[model samples]
Target: MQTVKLNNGIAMPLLGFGVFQMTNTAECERAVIDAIETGYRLIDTAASYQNETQVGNALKLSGIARDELFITTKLWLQDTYYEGAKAQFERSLNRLQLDYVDLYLIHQPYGDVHGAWRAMEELHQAGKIRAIGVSNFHPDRLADLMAFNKIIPAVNQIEVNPFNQQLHAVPWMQSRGIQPEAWAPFAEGRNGLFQNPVLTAIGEKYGKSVGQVVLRWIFQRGIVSLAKSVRKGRMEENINILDFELSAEDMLQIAALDTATSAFFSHRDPAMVEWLTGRKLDV
Candidate 1:
């Protein structure tokens, strides 16, 4: 697997497996174990996902040394303050059955972000986390955090795919030495992504699938991507993208497919913000 060096000098895999909607314990555990067996060293989960224990179980069962695997999880919106963040970070580590996490993130951009970030910086300094970052943060909020924080975020995990290609945000993040990571690399299989003509034609040229082409495009653009799948064969296909390269012209054709927007709800909208923040998780 190819890796990108973070601002903090940590090298993370360019491709990773995500366990976002795998709520079933047995299913998530099996999926993670299969993903590892299929050669995925980076696994992304979240505190809100309610499967940290399952993920932890899978990690132990895989028999891979902890040092060799890069595991990432996020802090929920409920824990977006200093003390709450401190408690939740330790809780997540405890649930994951690990002393430290390779990467930790603020799941949303809301709440006491400054306070939360302060806690994260302290944790990073204390060697509890290798890297600290944020998810779902747009340019304005990201700039604000970058301006005030002691330690700049190492990565910003956002929605980036063929349809919602974050053209403007990517450059801004790169300018500040913050790596951009894609969460929904497949667009959750929406917008006819799998059968799109442009992607299919490009895949034909490279002798790859549409999913492979998408992952390759993301990797080529210097972004870390998390492609999710519960099936072993799909996990194999997602990681298989490292071998192929898209031409400059091929990249341009795919670039034309960008809508310059997110397929999911916008964080800028107040209604969506309320919904996201108000929702309580039993986890």
Candidate 2:
């Protein structure tokens, strides 16, 4: 597995397991174990996922040493202040049943982000979290936050896929020594992505599936990608991208598939926020 070194000198796997919409305890736990059993060392979860305890159970069942795994969880939008963020982290830690997490992220750009980030920085410094980052932060907000933030975030997690690549943010993040990580790397299978001609042709050349082609394309961009799959075969196929390489021209073709739009609801839309944050994941 390829690893990306954060500014803080922490090594995080470039390809990770993501538990985004997996809300059920038994299902999420089984999926996590499958991912671990398939050689995935990086596990991405969040307090909002309502399955941190399931993740904990899976990790412990795998019998992998705590140090061998890179576990990442996010501070939910509700926990957006210093005290709230700290409290949420404790809650997440207790649920995961771990002393320290490999990485922790501020889940969104909303709410009192400055206070949240301040607390994250302190956590990073104190070894509570090996690396601290932000997710879903637009460029303008990210720039402003960096201006006042004493410590540069080690990673930025965003909606990145063939359709909504966020290509423009790549250079800026790299310039600041911040690694860009993809949250919804597959766009949740939106925008007819599986039928994309560019990706299809590229995959044909290598006899790979469209999904594998996209993963290879994103991975080669030097970004840490979190690919989620509940199925065993799909999970194995995602990890198999490590063996293949997308040529420069093939990469360009894949890049051309970007439509400059998110396959999911937009963050800038006010209605979307209410829709996203108003719901609770019942486990």
Candidate 3:
């Protein structure tokens, strides 16, 4: 697995497996175990996902050394504050059955972010988390956090795909040494991403699947990407991206496919903010 060095100097795998909506306990656990066996060392989950326990079970069953695995979990909106963040992060660690997480993110860019970040900085300082980051942060939000805080976010995990490619934001983060992580690198298969003519055309040139092409494109952009799959074969397919490189022409061809809008909901929406802040979590 190829790794990208974070601003804090911790190396994380470029391609990772994400368990965003894998709610079924047994299914998620099995999927994660299979992913580990299939050579995925990086696993991404969140407290909001409500499957951290399953992920932890899989990790224990997989029997891989903790040092060999890179696990990332997030702080939900309900816990996005000073004491709330500090308390909830310990909850995540307990659910994951791990003493520390490689990366811990503010799940959404909502609610008392300054306070939340302060808590995260404390956790990082205490060595409970290796690196701290934010999710759904637009460039201005990134700027706000960067401007006000002593600790610059080591990563900004955002939605990036061919349709909603973070063309401008990725560069801004990269130039400033923040690792841009793609949460939905496959756009969750929305907008016919798997069957799109443009992507299929590029896939044909390299004899790769649409999924592989997308991951490879993200890799070439120097962005860390999370690819979610419940099936064993798809897990293998997503990680197969590292072997081939996309040509500059292919890169430009895919770049032209950007719509500059999210395939999912926007973090900037006031309604979404209200919903997120009001959303309750069991953990």
Candidate 4:
């Protein structure tokens, strides 16, 4: 797998497996094991995903060395302050059955995020986490945090797909040296994405699936994507994006697919903050 160098020089997979909405422990654990067996090194889970224990179980059962797997977990908004952060961090580690995490992120920009960041920075310095980052943070909030924090976040995992391209902020994020990672890289098949004429046409030419076309498009744009799937075949297909390249015309066509709107709620949306901070993952 190709890797990206974080601002702090930590290497992360360009594409990883995300355990989103996979609530069943056994199923999530089995899926993670399948991905690892199929050659996935990066596994992403969150406090809200409520399957960290399973993910960690899969890792241990897979028998892969801890360093070989890039494990990431997030802290919910409810645990956004320093003490809460410390407490939540312990819980995540305990649930995951891990001693440390490769990456630990503040799941949302709510509650005591400033306090959470302070704790995350300390954790990062103390080597408990290899890298620290935030999710769903828009350019404005990101800027404010970056200015105040001594260590800039290595990543900002945001929603990015053909429909909601965030064109205005891409340059701004690049300017700040923060790698922009995609949370919902495929938009969960929104805008007829899987059957979009452009993607299908391009897929036909390369003998690739529409999903592969979309994933390759994200890859070509220098964004890391975390795609989740429960099926074994789908998991295999998701990791197999390195064999080909998208042509300029192919890329332009996919780029034209951008609609400047997210079917999912926007990070900057007022209602989102409450939703993100309120919901706690069962894992």
Compared with the true structure, what per-residue lDDT tens digits does model 1 show for residues 1-283? Answer: 6898999999999889999756479999999999999999999999999999999999999989999999999999898999999999999999999999999999999999999999999999999999999999988988899899889999999999999999989989998999999988778888888999999999999899999999999998899999888889988888987677999999999999999777788888999988999989865
Tens-place lDDT per residue, model 3, 1-283, is 6898899999999989998665479999999999999999999999999999999999999989999999999998888889999999999999999999999999888889999999999999999999999988988999999999999999999999998988899999998899999988878788888899998998998899998999999999899989888899989888887678899999999999999889889877899878778877698
Judged by lDDT relative to the true structure, which candidate is superior, 2 or 3? Answer: 3
Model 4 alpha-carbon drift over 4 Å, by segment: 280-283
Q: Candidate 2 residues 111-208, lDDT tens each? A: 89999999988887788988888888887877888899898788888888988888788878888888999877778777777887888888989989
Better of 1 and 2 by lDDT: 1
Task: Tell me which of candidates 2 and 4 scores higher on lDDT.
Answer: 2
TM-scores for the candidates: 0.98, 0.95, 0.98, 0.96
Candidate 4 per-residue C-alpha lDDT over 1-283 given as tens digits, one digit per residue, 9 for 90 to 100: 7999999989999988888765477888898999898888988988877777788788889989998999989998777898989888989999899889999988878888889999999888888999999888889889999888898988888888888876777667778888888877778987678888888899899888888887888888888888888898997888888998899999888878788887787667778866666665553
Which pairs clash in model 4? 50-283
Candidate order by decreasing lDDT: 1, 3, 2, 4
lDDT for position 68 in model 2: 97
Q: Which residue pairs clash in candidate 3?
A: none
Please give the range of 10 consecutive residues that has the lowest summed lDDT in model 4: 274-283
User: Residue 115, candidate 4: how far off, in angstroms?
Assistant: 0.7
Error of 4 at 151 (Å): 0.6
The local lDDT score (0 to 100) that residue 176 gets in candidate 4 is: 86
Number of the candidate with higher lDDT, 1 or 4:
1
